[PDB]
Amino acid sequence: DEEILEKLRSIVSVGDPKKKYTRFEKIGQGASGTVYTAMDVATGQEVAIKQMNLQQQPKKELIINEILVMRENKNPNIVNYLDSYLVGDELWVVMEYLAGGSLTDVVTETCMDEGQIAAVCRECLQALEFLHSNQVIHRNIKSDNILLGMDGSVKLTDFGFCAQITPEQSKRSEMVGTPYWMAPEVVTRKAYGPKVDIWSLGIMAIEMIEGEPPYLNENPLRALYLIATNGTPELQNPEKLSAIFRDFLNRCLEMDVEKRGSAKELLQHQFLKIAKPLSSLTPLIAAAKEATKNN
Template sequence: MTDEEIMEKLRTIVSIGDSKKKYTRYEKFGQGASGTVFTDTDVALGQEVAIKEINLQKQPKKELIINEILVMKEFKTPNIVNFLDSYVVRDELFVVIKYLAGGSLTDVVTETCMNEAQIAAVGRECLQALEFLHVYQVIHRDIKSDNVLLGMEGSVKLIDFGFCAQITPEQSKRSTMVETPYWMAPEVVTQKAYSPKVDIRSLGIMAIEMVEEGRSLCLSENPLRALYLIHPFLKLAKPFSSLTPLIMAAKEEMKSHC
């Protein structure tokens, strides 16, 4: 798609108006590769929100942004981030989602040590999100700790649907290489035909990431064996409120680095 076609398509799926007239506080929360994240309060909804501001001119693959908005708008389930609204103002795209104060799973795996039951709790919640997506023949294709957000009460939600792909009865498998390499299944790396099962492989690697406290992954015999063992392992899962102490500990550790 050309830039003009992308902008035209975006304008058909976003809300009319300027988000800065509705959200005025705009406190900076974080900075990602695709844009800046702010927090604010939606008075009408009575809840805190996160607003991702994306400069469209700086995005090399703008069509992925369209894909992300469409997936978040269409698919609603407790384990997928709550999409609230989106706006385009000149060359800026504003995506509004429910704010999750726990931050990303990456913060927890790098700053704390998770026990087996807590790892199983995260795995169980992510599997519920993937089960929902896979029923609708949607492959996430980028499962990793960066793309899992946590609520302070321990809720677990998938984010970042830019790499999602839909398969159809006529095209039951995909063959494009788009995921983050360390989490990819072999068939994705070699660009062979693959199915939604690649998300389960990536989730297995993410489980190893949690065990190894975010350290580099070794794609060898042990990770593959762990992949086969992951479903019985989920029976160990604690309630996800058990994640709250880890989130608090991770935030304290991150403050000490400043």
């Protein structure tokens, strides 16, 4: 529709990004747009800006929904929205910039100890508690969507797949997310809720342990089948984990949605009590950057 486009345009101001921001440097590109780093002229704040051609963009309703969700869900454990501009047919969206890279770089190139894993899980559960208390389900938790500051701060990004629920409609039933990280009830199209994010967090903790989510060697379709049929995945070497870490994982990856922990109750779990300070993550960030120099 041209109606859905006009609705998208209406929630964005018309203006020039260069009035407030400079030193644009392209760090990425794709169909969904070009991504730059840039700087706030008045404050010196480094920012991340996405340039997007609106005409060609499919499923504009998801762009409307992401912008709306960010504007009303600002939090220290989220990669926050700063501003947006319309210029001609292109949309510019300004976000905080995190210079420490993604958690994916860390889990694929380093060995995290349990204190560092507990820290990351805590910060993520803080974001999830905030989101769920505002009836937002992320539905795409994975290390790729966890970004790190150079001080070890931990923030969640990418709200392109999130669902807003209501007491009227408090559950969803559609297969949305990234296969390896999807909870069984999502994969098999049952009525589901916020605890699907708790499952995906459990899979991300398996990333921090083993380097990959379960079945990454398989194609996405085979992985969906395996999740549906196996339920709670198995660790290669559970012997290597503490009793309290194993219990934390079990409570994230519980098949029974009523038995699975909420974000609020996992924030009280004993595993998080051994978390190291976030400064402990900066050597991992340094390692990850070194590892990925050649790409």
